Design a protein around this ligand. Sequence first.
Ligand code: FOY
Length: 126
Amino acid sequence: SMNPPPPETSNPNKPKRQTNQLQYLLRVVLKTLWKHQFAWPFQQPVDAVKLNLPDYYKIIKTPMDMGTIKKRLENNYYWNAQECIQDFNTMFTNCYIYNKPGDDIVLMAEALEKLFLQKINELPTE
Ligand SMILES: Cc1noc(C)c1-c1ccc(=O)n(Cc2ccccc2)c1
């Protein structure tokens, strides 16, 4: 079995822009989630080969993880904070779609997401 190629993190044709909101997403949001004790399953793409989950990529067609998000923030992939926010939301929603409610992995995604939303409430203007 095989894993797909990861989501794009470099593309010279895509316009990029630093915003103070993006900077906050990296400095504060990502940094804080990354260190949480339930971050580890979300720090890289789901390795469905290693995990013996051969249907994962038949079910989840827009994969996303905090590894990818960290690369997209550190090498400036985004034009705005909403694109980055959508990546986080995709990662969470994928977990809730693939797994069952009350699964441990779901409880872990849920704790991250709660923290994510708290941090998003302090997103600076502009
Ligand atoms: C994240 C994620 N979403 O769906 C799956 C499957 C994973 C995932 C990623 C790495 C990963 O190691 N797992 C196994 C695991 C981790 C914590 C608790 C229970 C099971 C699962």
